[PDB]
Short mmCIF file of C-alpha atoms and ligand atoms in Angstrom, two decimals:
data_model
loop_
_atom_site.label_atom_id
_atom_site.label_comp_id
_atom_site.label_asym_id
_atom_site.label_seq_id
_atom_site.Cartn_x
_atom_site.Cartn_y
_atom_site.Cartn_z
CA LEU T 1 -1.21 39.91 -24.60
CA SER T 2 -3.75 41.84 -22.47
CA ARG T 3 -5.87 39.56 -20.44
CA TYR T 4 -9.30 40.67 -21.85
CA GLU T 5 -7.60 40.65 -25.61
CA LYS T 6 -6.23 37.02 -24.84
CA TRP T 7 -9.72 36.07 -23.84
CA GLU T 8 -11.44 37.82 -26.57
CA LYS T 9 -9.33 35.81 -29.19
CA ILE T 10 -9.64 32.54 -27.66
CA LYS T 11 -13.36 33.08 -27.52
CA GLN T 12 -13.51 34.05 -31.14
CA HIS T 13 -11.32 30.99 -32.38
CA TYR T 14 -14.17 28.83 -30.71
CA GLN T 15 -17.27 30.94 -31.44
CA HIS T 16 -18.45 28.89 -34.28
CA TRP T 17 -17.97 25.65 -32.19
CA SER T 18 -19.90 27.11 -29.36
CA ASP T 19 -22.70 28.38 -31.81
CA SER T 20 -23.06 24.79 -32.98
CA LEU T 21 -23.35 23.26 -29.67
CA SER T 22 -26.68 21.37 -29.04
CA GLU T 23 -28.73 21.92 -26.15
CA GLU T 24 -27.59 18.17 -25.41
CA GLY T 25 -23.81 18.91 -25.52
CA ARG T 26 -24.43 22.04 -23.84
CA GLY T 27 -25.99 20.36 -21.00
CA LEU T 28 -23.15 17.45 -21.24
CA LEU T 29 -20.35 20.13 -20.48
CA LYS T 30 -22.26 21.52 -17.70
CA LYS T 31 -22.70 18.29 -16.16
CA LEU T 32 -18.86 17.49 -16.40
CA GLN T 33 -18.36 20.64 -14.68
CA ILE T 34 -20.71 20.51 -12.12
CA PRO T 35 -21.29 16.68 -11.13
CA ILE T 36 -24.84 15.66 -9.82
CA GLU T 37 -24.64 15.05 -6.01
CA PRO T 38 -26.82 12.76 -4.16
CA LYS T 39 -29.59 14.14 -2.45
CA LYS T 40 -29.09 13.50 1.19
CA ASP T 41 -33.14 13.36 1.82
CA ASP T 42 -33.38 10.40 -0.63
CA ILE T 43 -30.34 8.92 1.03
CA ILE T 44 -31.83 8.88 4.78
CA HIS T 45 -35.35 8.25 3.55
CA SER T 46 -34.11 4.85 2.03
CA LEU T 47 -32.56 3.70 5.35
CA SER T 48 -34.62 1.68 7.96
CA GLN T 49 -35.06 2.83 11.60
CA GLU T 50 -32.16 0.70 12.63
CA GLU T 51 -29.82 1.82 10.11
CA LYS T 52 -30.65 5.50 10.94
CA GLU T 53 -29.76 4.75 14.52
CA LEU T 54 -26.59 3.01 13.15
CA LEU T 55 -25.42 5.85 11.20
CA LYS T 56 -26.53 8.23 13.94
CA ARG T 57 -23.69 6.81 16.35
CA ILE T 58 -21.16 5.24 14.03
CA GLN T 59 -17.68 6.67 14.31
CA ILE T 60 -17.50 7.93 10.87
CA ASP T 61 -13.82 8.67 10.61
CA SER T 62 -12.93 5.51 12.10
CA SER T 63 -13.36 3.88 8.53
CA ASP T 64 -10.24 3.19 6.63
CA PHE T 65 -12.06 2.60 3.31
CA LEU T 66 -13.84 6.00 2.68
CA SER T 67 -12.44 9.31 0.84
CA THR T 68 -12.61 12.43 2.96
CA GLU T 69 -15.46 13.70 0.70
CA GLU T 70 -17.37 10.37 1.55
CA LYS T 71 -16.42 10.79 5.11
CA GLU T 72 -17.66 14.31 5.10
CA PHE T 73 -21.09 13.85 3.26
CA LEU T 74 -21.87 10.88 5.58
CA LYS T 75 -20.82 13.27 8.37
CA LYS T 76 -23.74 15.81 7.26
CA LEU T 77 -26.09 12.70 6.92
CA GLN T 78 -25.17 12.08 10.53
CA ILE T 79 -25.89 15.47 11.59
CA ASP T 80 -29.67 15.60 9.68
CA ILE T 81 -30.11 12.32 11.42
CA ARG T 82 -29.84 13.92 14.90
CA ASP T 83 -30.90 17.51 13.68
CA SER T 84 -33.96 16.73 15.85
CA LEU T 85 -32.02 15.82 19.21
CA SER T 86 -31.56 17.70 22.28
CA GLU T 87 -28.39 20.08 22.36
CA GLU T 88 -27.05 17.94 25.15
CA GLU T 89 -27.70 14.74 23.28
CA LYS T 90 -25.68 16.38 20.32
CA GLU T 91 -22.86 17.60 22.55
CA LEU T 92 -22.61 14.43 24.19
CA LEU T 93 -23.21 12.40 21.38
CA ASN T 94 -20.16 13.77 19.57
CA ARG T 95 -18.04 14.72 22.61
CA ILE T 96 -16.33 11.16 23.03
CA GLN T 97 -15.00 11.05 19.57
CA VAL T 98 -11.94 12.90 21.27
CA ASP T 99 -10.58 9.74 22.79
CA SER T 100 -12.38 8.01 20.14
CA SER T 101 -10.88 4.99 18.42
CA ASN T 102 -12.60 1.82 17.68
CA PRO T 103 -11.77 -0.07 14.49
CA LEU T 104 -15.17 -0.47 13.57
CA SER T 105 -17.46 -3.44 14.43
CA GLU T 106 -17.90 -6.04 11.74
CA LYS T 107 -21.51 -5.20 11.42
CA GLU T 108 -20.53 -1.24 11.13
CA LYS T 109 -17.93 -1.98 8.22
CA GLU T 110 -20.58 -4.06 6.24
CA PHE T 111 -23.06 -1.53 6.63
CA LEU T 112 -20.78 1.48 5.46
CA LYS T 113 -19.49 -0.77 2.68
CA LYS T 114 -22.86 -0.84 1.08
CA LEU T 115 -24.05 2.94 2.00
CA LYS T 116 -20.75 3.72 -0.06
CA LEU T 117 -22.39 2.61 -2.90
CA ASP T 118 -25.42 4.88 -2.63
CA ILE T 119 -23.59 8.14 -1.88
CA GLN T 120 -21.45 8.47 -5.11
CA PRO T 121 -22.30 11.65 -7.07
CA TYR T 122 -22.04 11.52 -11.05
CA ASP T 123 -18.60 12.67 -11.78
CA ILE T 124 -17.22 12.06 -15.27
CA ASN T 125 -13.81 13.71 -14.58
CA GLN T 126 -13.66 11.57 -11.28
CA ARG T 127 -14.59 8.64 -13.02
CA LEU T 128 -11.92 8.90 -15.45
CA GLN T 129 -9.33 9.93 -12.75
CA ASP T 130 -10.14 7.00 -10.39
CA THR T 131 -9.85 4.50 -13.33
CA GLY T 132 -6.79 6.33 -15.14
CA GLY T 133 -9.35 6.33 -18.31
CA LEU T 134 -9.79 2.40 -18.00
CA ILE T 135 -13.67 2.91 -17.67
CA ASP T 136 -14.69 -0.65 -18.29
CA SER T 137 -13.18 -1.49 -14.82
CA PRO T 138 -15.86 -3.25 -12.80
CA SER T 139 -15.68 -0.80 -10.01
CA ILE T 140 -19.46 0.53 -10.33
CA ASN T 141 -22.88 -0.53 -11.18
CA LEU T 142 -22.77 -1.85 -14.83
CA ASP T 143 -25.83 0.95 -15.86
CA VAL T 144 -23.78 3.56 -14.65
CA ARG T 145 -20.61 2.22 -16.10
CA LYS T 146 -22.39 2.63 -19.34
CA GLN T 147 -23.57 5.91 -18.88
CA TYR T 148 -20.00 7.24 -18.23
CA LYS T 149 -18.78 5.69 -21.35
CA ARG T 150 -21.60 7.40 -23.48
CA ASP T 151 -21.17 10.67 -21.89
CA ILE T 152 -17.31 10.23 -21.99
CA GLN T 153 -17.76 9.24 -25.95
CA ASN T 154 -20.10 12.28 -26.52
CA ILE T 155 -17.49 14.47 -25.21
CA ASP T 156 -14.45 13.19 -27.13
CA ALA T 157 -16.78 13.92 -30.08
CA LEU T 158 -17.36 17.34 -29.17
CA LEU T 159 -13.72 18.50 -28.32
CA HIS T 160 -12.44 18.20 -32.21
CA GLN T 161 -11.38 21.55 -32.53
CA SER T 162 -7.69 22.01 -32.21
CA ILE T 163 -6.08 25.36 -30.37
CA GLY T 164 -4.32 25.96 -33.81
CA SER T 165 -0.48 26.87 -34.92
CA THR T 166 -1.38 30.42 -34.73
CA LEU T 167 -2.27 30.36 -30.86
CA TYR T 168 -0.42 27.48 -29.26
CA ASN T 169 2.75 29.24 -28.64
CA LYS T 170 1.09 32.68 -28.09
CA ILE T 171 -0.62 31.80 -25.03
CA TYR T 172 -0.19 30.40 -21.75
CA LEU T 173 -3.20 28.55 -20.01
CA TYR T 174 -3.66 28.11 -16.19
CA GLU T 175 -4.74 25.61 -13.75
CA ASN T 176 -4.52 26.12 -9.59
CA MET T 177 -4.36 23.12 -7.91
CA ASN T 178 -4.45 21.55 -4.25
CA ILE T 179 -1.14 19.99 -3.38
CA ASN T 180 -3.29 17.09 -1.70
CA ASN T 181 -4.52 16.38 -5.01
CA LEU T 182 -1.32 14.79 -5.99
CA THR T 183 0.36 13.92 -2.59
CA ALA T 184 -1.56 13.73 0.46
CA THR T 185 1.62 12.92 2.27
CA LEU T 186 3.89 15.90 1.40
CA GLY T 187 0.75 18.11 1.15
CA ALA T 188 0.15 18.14 4.94
CA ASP T 189 3.83 19.18 5.54
CA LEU T 190 5.01 21.13 2.45
CA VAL T 191 3.66 24.57 3.72
CA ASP T 192 6.09 25.64 6.01
CA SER T 193 4.94 24.37 9.67
CA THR T 194 5.76 27.86 10.95
CA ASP T 195 5.25 30.17 8.63
CA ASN T 196 2.22 29.24 6.51
CA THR T 197 3.00 32.03 3.72
CA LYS T 198 6.06 29.90 2.94
CA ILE T 199 6.93 26.79 1.22
CA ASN T 200 9.39 24.34 2.93
CA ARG T 201 12.46 24.26 0.62
CA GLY T 202 13.51 20.83 1.75
CA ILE T 203 10.09 18.85 0.58
CA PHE T 204 9.99 21.41 -2.41
CA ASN T 205 13.23 19.58 -3.59
CA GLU T 206 11.94 16.31 -2.97
CA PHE T 207 8.42 17.37 -5.07
CA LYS T 208 10.41 18.90 -7.75
CA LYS T 209 13.12 16.37 -7.74
CA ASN T 210 11.32 13.60 -9.33
CA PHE T 211 8.57 15.66 -11.12
CA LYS T 212 9.53 15.36 -14.86
CA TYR T 213 5.87 14.15 -16.25
CA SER T 214 2.35 14.18 -15.72
CA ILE T 215 -0.59 12.52 -17.40
CA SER T 216 -4.15 13.64 -17.50
CA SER T 217 -6.59 10.97 -18.17
CA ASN T 218 -9.44 13.43 -17.58
CA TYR T 219 -10.51 16.64 -18.98
CA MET T 220 -8.70 19.72 -17.41
CA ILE T 221 -10.57 22.55 -17.14
CA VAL T 222 -8.07 25.40 -17.47
CA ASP T 223 -8.28 29.33 -17.11
CA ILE T 224 -7.25 31.62 -19.93
CA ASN T 225 -6.07 33.97 -17.51
CA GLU T 226 -4.40 32.95 -14.25
CA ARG T 227 -6.73 33.08 -11.30
CA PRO T 228 -5.79 34.21 -7.98
CA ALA T 229 -5.24 31.06 -5.73
CA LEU T 230 -8.19 30.07 -3.37
CA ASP T 231 -7.66 28.30 -0.11
CA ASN T 232 -5.75 25.34 -0.49
CA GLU T 233 -4.17 26.23 -4.05
CA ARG T 234 -0.64 26.27 -3.64
CA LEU T 235 -0.03 25.00 -6.99
CA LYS T 236 -0.09 27.62 -10.25
CA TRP T 237 0.32 25.66 -13.34
CA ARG T 238 1.33 27.48 -16.44
CA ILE T 239 0.63 25.28 -19.37
CA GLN T 240 1.76 25.39 -23.19
CA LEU T 241 -0.70 23.83 -25.67
CA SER T 242 0.68 21.80 -28.51
CA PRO T 243 -0.89 23.29 -32.01
CA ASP T 244 -2.78 20.11 -32.34
CA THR T 245 -4.23 19.60 -28.74
CA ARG T 246 -8.11 19.79 -29.02
CA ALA T 247 -10.37 21.89 -26.68
CA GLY T 248 -13.57 23.85 -26.20
CA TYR T 249 -14.53 27.11 -25.09
CA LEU T 250 -16.20 27.46 -21.60
CA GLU T 251 -17.98 30.75 -20.63
CA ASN T 252 -16.16 32.75 -18.14
CA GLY T 253 -12.79 32.67 -20.00
CA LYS T 254 -12.07 28.79 -19.76
CA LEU T 255 -11.09 25.96 -21.89
CA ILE T 256 -11.75 22.23 -21.61
CA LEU T 257 -9.23 20.15 -23.05
CA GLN T 258 -9.23 16.59 -24.46
CA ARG T 259 -8.47 13.95 -22.10
CA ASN T 260 -5.42 11.63 -22.50
CA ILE T 261 -2.81 14.30 -23.00
CA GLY T 262 0.84 14.24 -21.85
CA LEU T 263 2.56 17.02 -19.97
CA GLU T 264 6.11 17.52 -19.70
CA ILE T 265 7.52 19.40 -16.71
CA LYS T 266 9.69 22.03 -18.02
CA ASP T 267 10.18 24.16 -14.98
CA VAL T 268 9.12 24.30 -11.10
CA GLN T 269 9.84 27.20 -9.25
CA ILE T 270 8.82 28.80 -5.73
CA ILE T 271 7.32 32.22 -6.71
CA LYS T 272 5.51 34.92 -4.91
CA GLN T 273 2.25 36.05 -5.23
CA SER T 274 0.37 38.79 -2.68
CA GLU T 275 2.73 38.03 -0.15
CA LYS T 276 2.30 34.36 -0.25
CA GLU T 277 4.26 31.49 -1.57
CA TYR T 278 3.12 29.30 -4.19
CA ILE T 279 4.53 26.53 -6.32
CA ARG T 280 4.80 27.70 -10.09
CA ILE T 281 4.78 24.62 -12.34
CA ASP T 282 5.75 25.37 -16.17
CA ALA T 283 4.36 22.59 -18.31
CA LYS T 284 4.06 21.79 -22.23
CA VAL T 285 1.84 19.51 -23.69
CA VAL T 286 3.01 16.44 -25.40
CA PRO T 287 1.71 13.18 -26.93
CA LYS T 288 0.64 10.99 -24.02
CA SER T 289 2.34 8.27 -26.09
CA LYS T 290 5.75 9.90 -25.32
CA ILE T 291 5.16 9.48 -21.42
CA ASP T 292 3.53 6.13 -21.56
CA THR T 293 7.01 5.06 -23.27
CA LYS T 294 8.93 6.52 -20.54
CA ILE T 295 6.92 4.83 -18.10
CA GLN T 296 7.00 1.40 -19.78
CA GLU T 297 11.07 1.69 -20.04
CA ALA T 298 11.12 2.64 -16.65
CA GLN T 299 8.78 -0.61 -15.86
CA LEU T 300 11.42 -2.69 -17.80
CA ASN T 301 14.50 -1.55 -16.13
CA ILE T 302 13.29 -1.97 -12.62
CA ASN T 303 12.06 -5.33 -13.19
CA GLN T 304 15.52 -6.30 -14.66
CA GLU T 305 17.34 -4.40 -11.95
CA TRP T 306 15.46 -6.65 -9.19
CA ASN T 307 15.23 -9.93 -11.04
CA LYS T 308 18.77 -9.78 -10.89
CA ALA T 309 19.18 -8.47 -7.20
CA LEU T 310 16.34 -11.16 -6.16
CA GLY T 311 17.58 -14.03 -8.35
CA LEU T 312 14.68 -14.51 -10.55
CA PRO T 313 14.39 -15.52 -14.40
CA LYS T 314 15.04 -11.96 -16.26
CA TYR T 315 11.71 -11.56 -18.10
CA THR T 316 9.88 -12.01 -14.67
CA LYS T 317 6.94 -9.32 -14.50
CA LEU T 318 7.18 -8.67 -10.78
CA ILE T 319 6.52 -4.86 -10.80
CA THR T 320 3.84 -2.78 -12.51
CA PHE T 321 3.60 0.68 -12.70
CA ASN T 322 -0.03 1.36 -13.29
CA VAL T 323 0.28 4.97 -13.80
CA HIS T 324 -2.45 7.34 -15.56
CA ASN T 325 -2.63 10.69 -13.34
CA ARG T 326 -1.05 13.98 -13.15
CA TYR T 327 1.89 13.05 -10.50
CA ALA T 328 3.21 10.36 -12.89
CA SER T 329 6.64 10.78 -13.07
CA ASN T 330 6.47 10.77 -8.82
CA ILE T 331 5.02 7.26 -8.70
CA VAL T 332 7.67 5.72 -10.99
CA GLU T 333 10.39 7.45 -9.09
CA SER T 334 8.78 6.64 -5.62
CA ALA T 335 8.71 2.83 -6.36
CA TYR T 336 12.77 2.80 -6.68
CA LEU T 337 13.30 4.50 -3.37
CA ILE T 338 10.39 2.14 -1.77
CA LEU T 339 12.06 -1.11 -2.95
CA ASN T 340 15.32 0.19 -1.69
CA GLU T 341 14.14 0.95 1.97
CA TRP T 342 12.46 -2.36 1.65
CA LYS T 343 15.71 -4.23 0.45
CA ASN T 344 17.71 -2.13 3.48
CA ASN T 345 15.61 -2.87 6.19
CA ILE T 346 14.57 -6.63 5.73
CA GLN T 347 16.79 -9.89 5.74
CA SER T 348 17.54 -10.60 2.49
CA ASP T 349 16.37 -14.21 2.77
CA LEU T 350 13.33 -13.21 3.87
CA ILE T 351 12.76 -11.07 0.89
CA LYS T 352 13.80 -13.73 -1.47
CA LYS T 353 11.80 -16.79 0.16
CA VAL T 354 8.44 -14.54 0.10
CA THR T 355 9.04 -12.85 -3.14
CA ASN T 356 9.39 -16.14 -4.64
CA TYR T 357 6.20 -17.38 -3.04
CA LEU T 358 4.35 -14.36 -4.64
CA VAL T 359 6.08 -14.91 -8.29
CA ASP T 360 4.92 -18.49 -7.94
CA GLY T 361 1.39 -17.41 -7.71
CA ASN T 362 2.00 -15.18 -10.50
CA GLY T 363 1.93 -12.16 -8.01
CA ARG T 364 2.82 -8.25 -8.50
CA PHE T 365 4.00 -5.36 -6.91
CA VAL T 366 1.58 -2.75 -8.14
CA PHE T 367 2.57 0.80 -7.89
CA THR T 368 -0.11 3.07 -8.97
CA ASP T 369 -2.17 6.60 -9.18
CA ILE T 370 -5.40 5.02 -9.91
CA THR T 371 -7.80 3.86 -7.14
CA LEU T 372 -7.54 0.23 -5.84
CA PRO T 373 -10.86 -1.09 -7.02
CA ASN T 374 -9.54 -0.71 -10.47
CA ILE T 375 -6.36 -2.64 -10.12
CA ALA T 376 -7.26 -6.16 -11.68
CA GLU T 377 -5.11 -7.79 -9.09
CA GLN T 378 -7.80 -6.90 -6.85
CA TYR T 379 -10.93 -6.56 -8.93
CA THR T 380 -10.64 -10.21 -10.66
CA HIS T 381 -10.95 -11.79 -7.29
CA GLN T 382 -13.58 -9.27 -5.88
CA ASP T 383 -16.86 -9.33 -7.90
CA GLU T 384 -18.94 -7.74 -5.41
CA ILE T 385 -18.31 -4.11 -5.63
CA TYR T 386 -19.42 -3.65 -1.93
CA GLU T 387 -16.17 -5.29 -0.99
CA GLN T 388 -13.82 -3.83 -3.16
CA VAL T 389 -11.52 -1.27 -1.42
CA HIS T 390 -9.43 1.66 -2.06
CA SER T 391 -6.98 2.79 0.68
CA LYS T 392 -3.11 3.36 0.67
CA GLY T 393 -1.94 0.01 0.53
CA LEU T 394 -3.44 -3.48 0.15
CA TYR T 395 -2.36 -7.37 -0.25
CA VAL T 396 -4.36 -9.71 -2.12
CA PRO T 397 -3.88 -13.22 -1.15
CA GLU T 398 -5.56 -14.72 -4.20
CA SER T 399 -3.32 -13.26 -6.41
CA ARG T 400 -0.40 -12.70 -4.24
CA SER T 401 0.01 -9.10 -4.89
CA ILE T 402 0.72 -5.73 -3.16
CA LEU T 403 -1.18 -2.84 -4.30
CA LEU T 404 0.30 0.46 -3.37
CA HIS T 405 -1.40 3.78 -4.04
CA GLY T 406 0.69 6.73 -4.30
CA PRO T 407 -1.33 10.03 -3.84
CA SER T 408 -3.30 8.80 -0.54
CA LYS T 409 -2.15 8.91 2.81
CA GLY T 410 -2.09 5.91 4.95
CA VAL T 411 -3.11 5.70 8.80
CA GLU T 412 0.05 7.22 10.91
CA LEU T 413 2.56 6.29 8.40
CA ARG T 414 5.67 8.74 7.49
CA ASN T 415 6.11 7.70 3.87
CA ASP T 416 5.26 4.93 1.45
CA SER T 417 8.07 2.58 1.94
CA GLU T 418 6.36 2.06 5.38
CA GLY T 419 3.06 1.45 3.87
CA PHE T 420 4.96 -1.43 1.62
CA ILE T 421 6.85 -2.90 4.47
CA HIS T 422 3.51 -3.28 6.23
CA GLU T 423 1.85 -4.65 3.02
CA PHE T 424 4.88 -7.17 2.74
CA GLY T 425 4.10 -8.25 6.58
CA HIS T 426 0.84 -9.61 5.14
CA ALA T 427 2.48 -11.65 2.50
CA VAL T 428 4.94 -12.72 5.11
CA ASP T 429 1.62 -14.00 7.34
CA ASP T 430 0.38 -15.65 3.88
CA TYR T 431 3.54 -17.76 3.33
CA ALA T 432 4.06 -18.68 6.64
CA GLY T 433 0.77 -20.12 6.93
CA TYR T 434 1.36 -21.74 3.84
CA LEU T 435 4.73 -23.41 4.73
CA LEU T 436 2.64 -24.91 7.72
CA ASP T 437 0.18 -26.56 5.66
CA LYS T 438 0.65 -26.60 1.65
CA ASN T 439 -2.52 -29.27 1.66
CA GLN T 440 -4.77 -26.53 3.03
CA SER T 441 -3.36 -23.04 2.64
CA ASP T 442 -4.46 -20.51 5.40
CA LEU T 443 -2.90 -17.33 7.00
CA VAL T 444 -0.50 -17.88 9.87
CA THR T 445 -2.58 -15.29 11.85
CA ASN T 446 -5.60 -17.46 11.75
CA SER T 447 -3.69 -19.97 13.98
CA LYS T 448 -5.03 -20.52 17.47
CA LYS T 449 -1.64 -19.41 18.68
CA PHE T 450 -1.47 -15.97 17.43
CA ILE T 451 -5.25 -15.36 17.82
CA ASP T 452 -4.65 -15.79 21.58
CA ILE T 453 -1.81 -13.65 21.40
CA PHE T 454 -3.74 -11.09 19.56
CA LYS T 455 -6.69 -10.97 22.18
CA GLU T 456 -3.54 -10.23 24.72
CA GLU T 457 -1.12 -7.94 23.15
CA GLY T 458 -3.52 -6.78 20.18
CA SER T 459 -3.69 -3.23 21.55
CA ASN T 460 -0.45 -2.75 22.73
CA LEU T 461 1.05 -1.32 19.30
CA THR T 462 -0.52 1.46 16.82
CA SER T 463 -4.17 2.12 17.04
CA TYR T 464 -4.54 0.75 13.34
CA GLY T 465 -2.94 -2.47 15.25
CA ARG T 466 -6.28 -3.17 16.82
CA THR T 467 -8.46 -3.66 13.71
CA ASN T 468 -8.08 -7.48 13.51
CA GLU T 469 -5.45 -10.22 13.83
CA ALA T 470 -4.16 -9.93 10.14
CA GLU T 471 -3.65 -6.06 10.56
CA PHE T 472 -1.94 -6.43 14.07
CA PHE T 473 0.65 -8.73 12.55
CA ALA T 474 1.36 -6.66 9.73
CA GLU T 475 1.74 -3.27 11.97
CA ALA T 476 4.07 -5.35 14.48
CA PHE T 477 6.09 -6.62 11.42
CA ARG T 478 6.14 -2.81 10.02
CA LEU T 479 7.50 -1.47 13.31
CA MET T 480 10.08 -4.18 13.82
CA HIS T 481 11.34 -3.15 10.75
CA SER T 482 11.46 0.71 11.15
CA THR T 483 14.32 2.99 10.31
CA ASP T 484 14.01 4.30 13.79
CA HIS T 485 15.36 1.76 16.88
CA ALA T 486 12.91 3.33 19.29
CA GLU T 487 10.04 1.72 17.41
CA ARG T 488 11.76 -1.82 16.98
CA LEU T 489 11.97 -1.85 20.64
CA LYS T 490 8.64 -0.83 21.68
CA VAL T 491 7.45 -3.80 19.74
CA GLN T 492 9.86 -6.30 21.52
CA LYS T 493 8.88 -4.58 24.72
CA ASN T 494 5.18 -3.60 24.57
CA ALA T 495 4.68 -6.85 22.64
CA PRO T 496 6.74 -9.77 23.32
CA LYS T 497 4.54 -12.62 22.54
CA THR T 498 3.98 -10.80 18.95
CA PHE T 499 7.70 -10.04 18.62
CA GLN T 500 8.80 -13.61 19.29
CA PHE T 501 5.93 -15.04 17.22
CA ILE T 502 6.94 -12.92 14.20
CA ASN T 503 10.82 -13.81 14.70
CA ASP T 504 9.57 -17.51 14.89
CA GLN T 505 7.62 -17.18 11.69
CA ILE T 506 10.74 -15.49 9.77
CA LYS T 507 13.03 -18.07 10.91
CA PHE T 508 10.73 -20.77 9.76
CA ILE T 509 10.43 -19.17 6.33
CA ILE T 510 14.46 -18.84 6.24
CA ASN T 511 15.00 -22.39 7.07
CA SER T 512 12.29 -24.02 4.95
CA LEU T 513 13.91 -26.26 1.93
CA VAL T 514 13.55 -25.26 -1.94
C1 915 H 1 -1.01 1.34 8.83
C2 915 H 1 -1.46 1.09 7.52
C3 915 H 1 -2.58 1.24 6.66
C4 915 H 1 -2.70 1.20 5.54
S1 915 H 1 -4.46 1.43 4.84
O1 915 H 1 -4.93 2.61 5.49
O2 915 H 1 -4.59 1.25 3.52
N1 915 H 1 -5.47 -0.10 5.36
C5 915 H 1 -5.61 -1.07 4.38
C6 915 H 1 -4.52 -1.89 4.82
O3 915 H 1 -4.33 -2.33 6.14
N2 915 H 1 -3.91 -2.41 3.70
O4 915 H 1 -3.10 -3.49 3.96
C7 915 H 1 -6.85 -1.79 4.82
C8 915 H 1 -8.28 -0.88 4.31
C9 915 H 1 -9.64 -1.83 4.44
O5 915 H 1 -9.26 -2.92 3.95
C10 915 H 1 -8.57 -3.98 4.20
C11 915 H 1 -7.21 -3.23 3.79
C12 915 H 1 -1.80 0.63 4.74
C13 915 H 1 -0.73 0.28 5.10
C14 915 H 1 -0.24 0.57 6.72
F1 915 H 1 0.80 0.08 6.99
ZN1 ZN H 2 -2.90 -4.28 6.33
#
């Protein structure tokens, strides 16, 4: 009631709390709000001459294991490295990335895999979001892992004062959000292709359809009064807190809320602000446990549903929903769609045989909104942090699992179903090689036959198909099972030796005896 009035009231409620903050608890909240960024100087200085030259040339955007932010920071490093080369050199040494696509050299990936460790910012809210709160996951340096733990414990203890039974229902809190923070997929096609000031009604129904609940595993920083959207801020959350939600007052009319809260999506509409269309999200704070309960129930249902269809013992734990972030209900809902597309597009006998092979190794299909290095099915078989990978999808042979990360975007994929089919291609590759040699299991694509076929047809299909034999097989396998016939034909057409090689590996799997 009165924007300035609302502000003043909330501030006063928290006034004593703010006055009691130590210079330590006050520096902590500042660190939480403004993460400590790596110094570009320090980084470049730590490199040797050869590494500088490598970093200088390397096709940064070619890496499939780096976030945009990490790709970008690295590109500034690249500029500074050449920030002392002729204009022509600079224009030339960058005007070839146009027709540039070269899955990096092994020696390039190794270098970047290690450099990625040195370019991380100290970001408490990101750590929590990336791990879904599972802050002991061995996805970062032990020493840094412990500092995060301490800061987080320290911040949890500061945020002890509830909003109160007087204010909760008397105030809405706000949050602007970039759609790409929940769905990088819908995000790049949910703003009307033609008129950017509008929302595509088709997608919006998509988005909305399955948006029932959301979790915050980090500390939401919310505005006491709604703020005009910035650039890519097409989501405008209107949040109602529970009488017992803990928070702290932040200068400039903001609140930091306690981590691990649950939210119930009450209404989602398309609304108009300053002549542009925005998506309004009305949410209500509820206990996380009440949402974790919906998730565990959805997990049990999907497994019982599939254990029957795939004829496995009912109690079989095949599917895991490792869900902790703000687009939670979508990840759950998405898994149903994906497994349906998978079944509607691949011979039932291929599905059963391969899925049984995974099950025999205690494999899983992991649908998640936390980064892949934090999924035990990967990390328990990858001690070296530099070899751990975050990406749209992953197949881990050692654990016979498929990991599929919801929020990210895969290379030239239309949807998550397709990422899944590609991952299943990896599993098919594994099983086939196994069938040929149970006494020395190896991947079919490691066969001399396929290797020669790769050296010949390896570049005929997707750019991503060129990365290596394994991926080429997975990409052909995916395309051979697309929902669009044209794609299925181009493989048989443009890559007949591969097509026949896969169909032959499919036939072999189907024919083998139990
Ligand atoms: C075209 C395509 C790319 C990915 S990705 O963009 O997630 N790349 C990873 C992959 O192929 N996983 O199976 C790589 C990333 C580097 O480490 C190995 C897996 C996932 C599925 C898919 F269909
Ligand atoms: Zn792959």
